Each structure stands twice: as structure tokens, then as C-alpha cells.
Amino acid sequence: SVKSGSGPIDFWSSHPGQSSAAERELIGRFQDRFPTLSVKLIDAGKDYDEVAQKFNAALIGTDVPDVVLLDDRWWFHFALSGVLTALDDLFGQVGVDTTDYVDSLLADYEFNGRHYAVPYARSTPLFYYNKAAWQQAGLPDRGPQSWSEFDEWGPELQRVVGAGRSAHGWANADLISWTFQGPNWAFGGAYSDKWTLTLTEPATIAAGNFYRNSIHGKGYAAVANDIANEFATGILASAVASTGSLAGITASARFDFGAAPLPTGPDAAPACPTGGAGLAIPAKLSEERKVNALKFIAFVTNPTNTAYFSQQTGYLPVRKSAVDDASERHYLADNPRARVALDQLPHTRTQDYARVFLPGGDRIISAGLESIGLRGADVTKTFTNIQKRLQVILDRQIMRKLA
């Protein structure tokens, strides 16, 4: 009934950020430290969706991975189905320094007081801005302090970029439910409060109208297809995009640009989500194999190793004390925008259940936001329709399984 025996630890990864070389290096370091264990790096897919399907298929038998890379949406799907190990007892047995993981990044995998993965390849949104546009618009050299301040800046930025360009680009349906989460929170909205959907609450509708008005009424914003590229080529004076896009923008931009944390809510309330993927251990392993799997996961996400992974890939270090790593200190001093991304980590918030735990919630919310953005759909009508659809899916797929 379970995967037992002494075969190598099977690590299923999609090699996010083209990271197979970095992963092989981490495996080498692991095998040096644990000379009785070996790890097999398996190319389990080109992306997180493919890894999830490969895992799903493997679940019929015992050729499951020992360690599997699951994204922000897929981990709960599997945890709820009972096929992942709750890690807390193992954390304490192996002596994992859990308080040294970035608070939000570990909390991302918590449900009902139990943790089902460890953060591995993590990102957040970041506010990118064109300094030449900022200067022409007479703005201070910083990101906006609030979304409402930015909205005031917008029309002047639109004047200075000219025809066929925009002051701000919003992501399209591939990322907008992720990036809009921040401004929604900043305005007191949310997609949900735990399992209770809140798309139709007044603060959320107001945030939706802020977004709609930026594109239509005032018009300084646009929906961007390839947002990182539209920013880097100068079509957009600013954009919220992933920290994962920082290296690409740096390599492509032929103008001076800044990176800023997203505006907070009132009293510096966190208004920035996290994103990416973590490492989980399937439930159908023998106890011995689970222990070995956690030794691997804990090792490759230790302070030295997460710093290394970050330097190689552009993902963020998942340990608080990685800032004290010598190589990391050097890296941060050479790369101040990497430091902006780092410094935002204590000011992040776990994602709304409607996006990450509710099947397709990210895609359905994104489609609605894209409809508001591209077609000027009404916010109240759109959010109301979406909430009804999400409620049906939540009650049919998730709520019964929670008993």
C-alpha cells in the first residue's frame, strides 16, 4: 500500500526558472552531508500544472515521488484529498528550524494548524517604475505610498508617456487575480474571508471600481498581454509584475528603472501576496522514507542553500537568516532591487482562499477582472456573477470534504 524500501529519494520538479543545474548542485550538497542517501532528480513537467497531473496519475500505485513540487493552488487540492503528509510532527522530530522560515512563506501551507509543504521557489508582486517618466511627471523617486496616491499620479504619467503608451499596465487573465489581490487588500477588500466569499462586499466592489476607472474613466492604465516585456520596452511607465521578472527586465530595459514594494494598507497593513511553489511529501510513503524526504527538503531550503537557489534563479530566499549568509550579503549589495524584493517579505500576506483553495478560483476571478479591463464590464454585475459561480464550486468540491 505504500512506497517502501531503499531506492533513491525521487524528487519531482519542473525546474522552475530553468533551475535544473541549481537543483543538481543542491542534490550534490545533500549527498555530501547525507552520504547514505541518494536523490534522483526527475523532470516531472514543464510547469507546475504538468507536475500536478503526473503526481495525480502516480497516486493509483506506489511509484509516487518522495518529494514533489506543488504550487500555491495545487498543494491544497492534494492536501484536502488526503494524499499529502502533515509535516509538523516530522518538523519536530528532525529538528527543522521552522521559526527561521519567512513567516508568510511557511504559513502559505498551513491549514487547520497543520503544514503540508515547505516554501521552495517563491515570488511576490513588485511595483516597477520608469524613472524617466517619473522625472518628467515631477514625481518623487519612489513608488506610490497608497494606491490612491498612484491614481492621482496616473493622468500626469499618461501625459508624459504620450500616445500609444500607458502610465500603468495591469496583468491580463494569466496573472491579474494574483496581482490585483494587493490593491484589493489595500482598499479593505478581499475575494474571501476564509471560506466566506466577499467579492460583493462594498470595499471589494470599490477596489474593483478603482481598477476599472484606472483603465476606462481616467484611462491612464491598460491591460497588458506580456506585462514584463511591455514595461521593459517602454510601453508602460509602471506595472505590478512578479519578482521573477526582475532579471529579465534588468537585462532588457534601456532606461533607468526602479523597483518598489506594493503600497500597504492603512497603518502599514500587508497588502502584497506571495506566490510560487513548495515541496511536499506524499502520504503513501513508509515512515522511513518520509523522514528521509524531509531531511532533503529541510536541507535544500536551509539558509545557505535557499540563498544559493535565489542567486541562481531569481526566486526569493525562504529563510529569515539567509540575509546573514556571506554570499547573500555580497549579492544584495550588488543588487539593490533584489534587496527591495527581499525587504518586502515581512510585509506580505497569505492569499485569499477563493484564489488558492477554491478550484479554478484564480482563473475565474482573473477572467472577470480581464472582462472589466478589456470590455469595461460593470464591476458589481461581474463580481456578483463570479461570486455565485464560485459559491457553487466551493460547496460542491470543497466544503463536504472538510468534515
Question: 324, 41 in Cβ contact below 8 A?
Answer: no
Q: Kindly report the three-state secondary structure assignment for every residue of the chain.
A: CCECCCCCEEEEECCCCCCHHHHHHHHHHHHHHCCCCCEEEEECCCCHHHHHHHHHHHCCCCCCCCEEEEECCHHHHHHHCCCECCCHHHHHHHCCCHHHECHHHHHCCEECCEECCEEEEEECEEEEEEHHHHHHCCCCCCCCCCHHHHHHHHHHHHHHHCCCCECEEEECCCCHHHHCHHHHHHCCCCCEECCEECCCCHHHHHHHHHHHHHHCCCCCEEEECCHHHHHHCCCECEEEEEHHHHHHHHHHCCCCEEEECCCCCHHHCCCCECEEEEEECECCECHHHHHHHHHHHHHHCCHHHHHHHHHHHCCECCEHHHHHCHHHHHHHHHCHHHHHHHHHHHHCECCCHHHHCCCCHHHHHHHHHHHHHHHCCCHHHHHHHHHHHHHHHHHHHCHHHHC
Taking Cα atoms as reference points, which of 272, 248, 274, 277 lies closest to residue 262? 272
- The position carrying cell 501551507 is 109
Cβ contacts of 94 within 8 Å, gap of 6 or more: 291, 294, 295, 298
Taking Cα atoms as reference points, which of 282, 245, 349 lies closest to residue 70? 282
- The position carrying cell 543542491 is 26
CA distances from residue 248 to 5, 15, 17, 229, 343 in whole angstroms, order as listed: 44, 18, 11, 8, 20
Question: 370, 179 in Cβ contact below 8 A?
Answer: no
Q: Report the alpha-carbon distance of residue 144 to residue 163 in Å, rounded.
A: 23
Q: Report the alpha-carbon distance of residue 339 to residue 19 in Å, rounded.
A: 21
Taking Cα atoms as reference points, which of 321, 309, 271 lies closest to residue 125? 271
Which amino acid type is present at position 51? V
Number of independent structural domains in the chain:
1
Residue 209 half-sphere exposure toward CB, CA atoms < 13 A: 9
Q: Report the alpha-carbon distance of residue 194 to residue 112 in Å, rounded.
A: 11
Q: Report the alpha-carbon distance of residue 13 to residue 24 in Å, rounded.
A: 11
Give 63-66 contacts, CB < 8 A, sequence gap 24+. 63/3, 64/3, 64/10, 64/282, 64/284, 64/285, 65/10, 65/11, 65/12, 65/282, 66/3, 66/9, 66/10, 66/11, 66/281, 66/282, 66/285, 66/289, 66/292, 66/293, 66/296
Taking Cα atoms as reference points, which of 311, 306, 313 lies closest to residue 102? 306
Q: Report the alpha-carbon distance of residue 362 to residue 173 in Å, rounded.
A: 9
Which amino acid type is present at position 115? H
Cβ contacts of 133 within 8 Å, gap of 6 or more: 157, 160, 161, 167, 237, 238
Which amino acid type is present at position 48? Y
Taking Cα atoms as reference points, which of 341, 339, 340 lies closest to residue 328? 339
- Name the grid cell of 26: 543542491
- In this structure, the chain runs to a length of 403
Exp. method:
X-ray
Question: 220, 166 in Cβ contact below 8 A?
Answer: yes
Q: Report the alpha-carbon distance of residue 298 to residue 97 in Å, rounded.
A: 9
Pairing of strands 275-280, 221-224: unpaired
CA distances from residue 402 to 76, 108, 111, 170, 362 in whole angstroms, order as listed: 12, 18, 11, 35, 21
Q: Report the alpha-carbon distance of residue 301 to residue 26 in Å, rounded.
A: 9
- The position carrying cell 535544473 is 20
Supply φ then ψ for residue 142, to 5 degrees: -165, 160
| Domain encompassing residue 335 | 1-403
- Name the grid cell of 32: 555530501
Cβ contacts of 59 within 8 Å, gap of 6 or more: 83, 282, 284
Q: Report the alpha-carbon distance of residue 328 to residue 227 in Å, rounded.
A: 28
Can you give the CATH number for the domain in which 315 is found?
3.40.190.10
What's the reported resolution, in angstroms, to a tenth?
1.5
Q: Report the alpha-carbon distance of residue 158 to residue 152 in Å, rounded.
A: 11
- Name the grid cell of 252: 532588457
Question: 132, 255 in Cβ contact below 8 A?
Answer: yes
Q: Report the alpha-carbon distance of residue 358 to residue 354 in Å, rounded.
A: 5
Cβ contacts of 71 within 8 Å, gap of 6 or more: 48, 52, 276, 277
